[PDB]
Scaffold this active site. Structure first.
Site, short mmCIF file in Angstrom:
data_model
loop_
_atom_site.label_atom_id
_atom_site.label_comp_id
_atom_site.label_asym_id
_atom_site.label_seq_id
_atom_site.Cartn_x
_atom_site.Cartn_y
_atom_site.Cartn_z
N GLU A 1 -11.92 6.66 -3.96
CA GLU A 1 -12.42 7.79 -3.19
C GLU A 1 -11.92 9.08 -3.78
OE1 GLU A 1 -10.65 8.17 0.62
OE2 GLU A 1 -11.65 10.10 1.02
N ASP B 1 -10.18 2.73 -0.90
CA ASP B 1 -9.91 3.93 -0.12
C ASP B 1 -8.43 3.82 0.18
OD1 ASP B 1 -9.60 5.96 1.82
OD2 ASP B 1 -11.58 5.63 2.73
N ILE C 1 -6.16 5.70 1.73
CA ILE C 1 -5.78 5.88 3.12
C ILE C 1 -7.07 6.25 3.78
CG2 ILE C 1 -4.54 7.24 4.79
CD1 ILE C 1 -2.59 8.00 2.77
N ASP C 2 -7.60 5.29 4.53
CA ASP C 2 -8.70 5.53 5.45
C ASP C 2 -8.11 5.85 6.80
OD1 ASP C 2 -11.56 5.54 5.98
OD2 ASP C 2 -11.13 3.82 7.25
N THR D 1 -6.94 9.56 7.13
CA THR D 1 -6.04 10.59 6.65
C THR D 1 -5.56 11.54 7.74
OG1 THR D 1 -7.11 10.53 4.50
CG2 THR D 1 -5.77 12.46 5.05
N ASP E 1 -15.50 3.27 2.38
CA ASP E 1 -15.30 3.13 3.81
C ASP E 1 -15.61 1.74 4.29
OD1 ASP E 1 -14.59 5.80 4.23
OD2 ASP E 1 -16.71 6.39 4.06
MN LIG Z 1 -9.40 8.04 2.50
MN LIG Z 2 -12.69 6.80 4.49
#
Ligand SMILES: [Mn+2]
Ligand SMILES: [Mn+2]
Ligand SMILES: [Mn+2]
Ligand SMILES: [Mn+2]
Lengths: 266, 272
Positions: A66, A86, A88-89, A91, A216
């Site tokens: 990402e 990703d 850190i989904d 944030t 995601d």
């Molecule tokens: Mn992220």
């Molecule tokens: Mn995300």
């Protein structure tokens, strides 16, 4: 393919350990495309920390990440083993110490997802799944709920990061329609990936969102389908990785009902 | 008051054991007000237990209780030691196994809340707070966020149980206003008691909601304020427990801002 998997789960439990060490510190929040579109060092550090170790053992493979796509590397997908990350989904959850933050990995070969790993680190919940081999959280098999009645379902969704007035108005408009069907409730924990994992578990019946990304949905999506659920586009058409709009439901009966209700934001 | 309180915490935990036992298996889901206003046997079971346990050792006391009020009892609070009880906060979460259901207990003497016990059994978390002695989740002391910039805020709220159209309209409206300040985001986990406990830990900066009852905030409220937070009415006025309206913020500055932006939703109080 059973090795790439175990490798992925170790990465993730490790990355997650960083993210969750980080959570409890003061951080510099940086913006990207808007004052609500955030990133921090850890997002970047963790992603680099991921892409290194993978390519340092799997160097033939492509990577979609990402934050790397942000700093200028390219978001195009081939049939080559692609790791889709990703770091850190969630944030903003991260920034706020709101306890839902997830490291999401997805391995698609031939543009199809083969396995997914989503680690929610505040919780200590490792979700994993393997095309045709089942979905699990912490070594316990998952299965989606049974509810075929929209009027008795609990949906999860996100409000979005767009504050583009027209984009906002359709977001809430759609929430209104579904809410008034009615349904038992709508919930949001702050991350597309943990939302989709709650659906895989049966705690919720469908998740829907327009304007998401590759990374995601690339870990949690296969955890939903292997818990017995279905992934669909918001349009009632098929779900491809590049679609930017999803519905992860327990069943097609529900997916199709949500679709009928909600107007596509372009 | 400690006696009464240290009894509460142990009762919360027994109630909690029951609820998270019940959540694993088959359920009788019935309706109160509507298609969407639910309740289960466990709800009623737990309230009766909790009240039969307190009225025993302290029969001198009153009890406002969610499901008691539903079987005809009355939510008039006086100066008597009242116990304010929500047997399961998050009954819909419960019905679905979406993993946030709290047992809430609040103790009022002379109409001021003395202590509160919110126990979220799935999480394993026991939030408590005695007036003047601070708030703790599971032992560890809690403290609200220091943020004072609305535009850097994470807010929690609920969509309410009403599908009364002019109400739902107003709900999504007040949401839009705040989202478009902008704030960083808005979350709903499904229970006002837990949403407020989160404000208390500083995971969120401010919760607000119109449509709650005294038993939703009686116990969680003192945890927030004892965490350094503030409670307020949506008018900027001082919080009224019976009003069906609440802002639980980390500070006056945030609480006053949300207050300014949102429209007041017409609701009948708990004392009418
Ligand atoms: Mn992220
Ligand atoms: Mn995300
Ligand atoms: Mn209740
Ligand atoms: Mn309640």
């Amino acid at each position: 393919w059973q090795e790439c998997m175990d490798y992925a789960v170790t990465l993730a439990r490790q990355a997650g350990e960083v993210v969750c060490e980080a959570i409890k510190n003061e951080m510099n929040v940086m913006l990207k495309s808007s004052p609500v579109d955030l990133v921090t060092a850890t997002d970047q550090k963790v992603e680099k920390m991921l892409i290194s170790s993978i390519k340092e053992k799997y160097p033939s493979h492509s990577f979609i990440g990402e934050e790397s796509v942000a700093a200028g590397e390219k978001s195009i997908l081939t049939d080559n083993p692609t790791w889709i990350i990703d770091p850190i989904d969630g944030t903003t959850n991260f920034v706020h110490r709101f306890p839902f933050v997830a490291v999401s990995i997805g391995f698609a070969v031939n543009k199809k997802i083969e396995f997914g790993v989503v680690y929610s680190c505040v919780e200590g919940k490792m979700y994993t799944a393997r095309k045709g081999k089942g979905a699990f959280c912490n070594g316990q098999k998952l299965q989606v709920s049974q509810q075929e009645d929209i009027t008795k379902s609990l949906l999860v969704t996100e409000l979005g990061s767009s504050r583009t007035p027209e984009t906002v108005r359709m977001v809430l408009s759609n929430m209104e329609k579904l809410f008034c069907i009615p349904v038992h409730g709508i919930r949001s924990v702050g991350t597309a990936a943990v939302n989709m994992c709650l659906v895989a578990t049966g705690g919720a019946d469908a998740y829907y969102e327009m304007g998401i990304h590759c990374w995601d949905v690339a870990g949690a999506g296969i955890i939903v389908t292997e818990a017995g659920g279905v992934l669909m586009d918001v349009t009632g058409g098929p779900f491809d990785l590049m679609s930017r709009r999803v519905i992860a439901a327990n069943n097609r009966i529900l997916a199709e009902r949500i679709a009928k209700e909600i107007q596509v934001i372009p």
